[PDB]
Amino acid sequence: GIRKVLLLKEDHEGLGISITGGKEHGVPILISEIHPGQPADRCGGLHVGDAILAVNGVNLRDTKHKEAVTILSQQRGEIEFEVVYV
Amino acid sequence: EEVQDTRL
């Protein structure tokens, strides 16, 4: 149930999506907050409700959600989202 | 914020 959404934000800065999950919350990094016209309408493929497990090359590290943050933070201006259906 | 969850 993988779904790749390529979100490349430049200049403007910031993304426009929110996540939470990991071994800390005993959950997967799931999208929980999506601002209108934000990465949901900017990548024409983002949207809360989907389960997240991979970015910029399937990287959702097993610790806490920040394992994704570390992944998305240091990666590149392109956020590749691979999502699974809960 | 401090734990590990996040907002992009």
From Swiss-Prot, chain A:
<comment type="function">
    <text>Plays a role in intracellular protein trafficking and degradation. May regulate CFTR chloride currents and acid-induced ASIC3 currents by modulating cell surface expression of both channels. May also regulate the intracellular trafficking of the ADR1B receptor. May play a role in autophagy. Together with MARCHF2 mediates the ubiquitination and lysosomal degradation of CFTR. Overexpression results in CFTR intracellular retention and lysosomaldegradation in the lysosomes.</text>
</comment>
<protein>
    <recommendedName>
        <fullName>Golgi-associated PDZ and coiled-coil motif-containing protein</fullName>
    </recommendedName>
</protein>
<feature type="domain" description="PDZ">
    <location>
        <begin position="4"/>
        <end position="86"/>
    </location>
</feature>
<comment type="subunit">
    <text>Homooligomer. Interacts with FZD5. Interacts with FZD8. Interacts with GRID2 and BECN1. Interacts with CSPG5. Interacts with CLCN3. Interacts with STX6. Interacts with CFTR. Interacts with ASIC3. Interacts with GOLGA3. Interacts with NLGN1. Interacts with RHOQ. Interacts with MARCHF2; the interaction leads to CFTR ubiquitination and degradation. Interacts with ADRB1. May interact with CACNG2. Interacts with CCDC62.</text>
</comment>
<comment type="subunit">
    <text>(Microbial infection) Interacts with C.rodentium and E.coli (strain Sakai) NleG8.</text>
</comment>
Swiss-Prot record, chain B:
<feature type="short sequence motif" description="PDZ-binding">
    <location>
        <begin position="6"/>
        <end position="8"/>
    </location>
</feature>
<protein>
    <recommendedName>
        <fullName>Cystic fibrosis transmembrane conductance regulator</fullName>
    </recommendedName>
</protein>
<feature type="compositionally biased region" description="Acidic residues">
    <location>
        <begin position="1"/>
        <end position="8"/>
    </location>
</feature>
<comment type="subunit">
    <text>Monomer; does not require oligomerization for channel activity. May form oligomers in the membrane. Interacts with SLC26A3, SLC26A6 and SHANK2. Interacts with NHERF1 and MYO6. Interacts (via C-terminus) with GOPC (via PDZ domain); this promotes CFTR internalization and thereby decreases channel activity. Interacts with SLC4A7 through NHERF1. Found in a complex with MYO5B and RAB11A. Interacts with ANO1. Interacts with SLC26A8. Interacts with AHCYL1; the interaction increases CFTR activity. Interacts with CSE1L.</text>
</comment>
<comment type="function">
    <text>Epithelial ion channel that plays an important role in the regulation of epithelial ion and water transport and fluid homeostasis. Mediates the transport of chloride ions across the cell membrane. Possesses an intrinsic ATPase activity and utilizes ATP to gate its channel; the passive flow of anions through the channel is gated by cycles of ATP binding and hydrolysis by the ATP-binding domains. The ion channel is also permeable to HCO(3)(-); selectivity depends on the extracellular chloride concentration. In vitro, mediates ATP-dependent glutathione flux.</text>
</comment>
<comment type="similarity">
    <text>Belongs to the ABC transporter superfamily. ABCC family. CFTR transporter (TC 3.A.1.202) subfamily.</text>
</comment>
